[PDB]
Amino acid sequence: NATFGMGDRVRKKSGAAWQGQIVGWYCTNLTPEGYAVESEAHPGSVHIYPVAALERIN
Amino acid sequence: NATFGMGDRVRKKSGAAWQGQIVGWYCTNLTPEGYAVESEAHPGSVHIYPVAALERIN
Amino acid sequence: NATFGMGDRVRKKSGAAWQGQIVGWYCTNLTPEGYAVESEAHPGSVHIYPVAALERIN
Amino acid sequence: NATFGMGDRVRKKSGAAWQGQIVGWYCTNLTPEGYAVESEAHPGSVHIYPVAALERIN
């Protein structure tokens, strides 16, 4: 039901930047569809974001 | 292959504290088995950790 | 010029929760007045937020 | 008493990567000397770390 899948390259749409691959997912009441994204610039660094904060890029 | 599953209550074993439910998972080369945990004290706040940093509690 | 000072007890006003003492500060173009807050529930755990996200409590 | 000052360029020494400018500081019992660092790769993104995790670079 997934907007993204593992390995998709995405970026944060606005505010503080973040860009890299989907490496996981999470689900809470506040964020029913969330993803973990490993930075392509800082290997090993991972942030989690709601789907609405991210967009897929080539 | 999962050490934990969704909804398990866990806590960080040492250093900065964290405690609440598993709400997701992630996988990188640095952390091949990682989990997202929603704080039971601060609803909506989620941290991600490697499995070795966490332990299941009742 | 500080809205808060070290040791003030504050909480996040909305969205994911966070509550505890001011333990530091930071400044970027996106967040020209930001604070570090140590959770009173999870000792050692610290989040940083823009001033507009926080409010002082007793 | 500061190891680093505002604007110093630093990087994380090991594990997950992080690199950019010092933009703040914090102090807790677990981390009596900590810094906020804004990523030079992801503008607006800031992480906090203990001094021992960081090193100054040119």
Side-chain angles (χ1 to χ4, degrees):
Chain A
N1 227 150
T3 298
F4 309 123
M6 291 296 284
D8 281 340
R9 188 182 188 198
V10 297
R11 68 186 188 203
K12 200 150 160 264
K13 297 174 197 173
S14 69
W18 199 256
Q19 186 165 119
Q21 284 230 140
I22 296 287
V23 297
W25 79 261
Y26 70 107
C27 169
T28 64
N29 279 57
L30 179 63
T31 299
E33 184 184 353
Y35 295 89
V37 181
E38 183 177 10
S39 172
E40 64 192 31
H42 300 311
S45 186
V46 181
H47 275 195
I48 44 168
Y49 291 107
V51 64
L54 297 170
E55 63 194 351
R56 188 162 55 102
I57 56 174
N58 283 116
Chain B
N1 227 150
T3 298
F4 309 123
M6 291 296 284
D8 281 340
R9 188 182 188 198
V10 297
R11 68 186 188 203
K12 200 150 160 264
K13 297 174 197 173
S14 69
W18 199 256
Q19 186 165 119
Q21 284 230 140
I22 296 287
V23 297
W25 79 261
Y26 70 107
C27 169
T28 64
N29 279 57
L30 179 63
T31 299
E33 184 184 353
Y35 295 89
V37 181
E38 183 177 10
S39 172
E40 64 192 31
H42 300 311
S45 186
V46 181
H47 275 195
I48 44 168
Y49 291 107
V51 64
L54 297 170
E55 63 194 351
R56 188 162 55 102
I57 56 174
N58 283 116
Chain C
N1 227 150
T3 298
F4 309 123
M6 291 296 284
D8 281 340
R9 188 182 188 198
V10 297
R11 68 186 188 203
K12 200 150 160 264
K13 297 174 197 173
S14 69
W18 199 256
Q19 186 165 119
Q21 284 230 140
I22 296 287
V23 297
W25 79 261
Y26 70 107
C27 169
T28 64
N29 279 57
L30 179 63
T31 299
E33 184 184 353
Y35 295 89
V37 181
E38 183 177 10
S39 172
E40 64 192 31
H42 300 311
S45 186
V46 181
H47 275 195
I48 44 168
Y49 291 107
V51 64
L54 297 170
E55 63 194 351
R56 188 162 55 102
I57 56 174
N58 283 116
Chain D
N1 227 150
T3 298
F4 309 123
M6 291 296 284
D8 281 340
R9 188 182 188 198
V10 297
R11 68 186 188 203
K12 200 150 160 264
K13 297 174 197 173
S14 69
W18 199 256
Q19 186 165 119
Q21 284 230 140
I22 296 287
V23 297
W25 79 261
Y26 70 107
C27 169
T28 64
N29 279 57
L30 179 63
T31 299
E33 184 184 353
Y35 295 89
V37 181
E38 183 177 10
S39 172
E40 64 192 31
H42 300 311
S45 186
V46 181
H47 275 195
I48 44 168
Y49 291 107
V51 64
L54 297 170
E55 63 194 351
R56 188 162 55 102
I57 56 174
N58 283 116

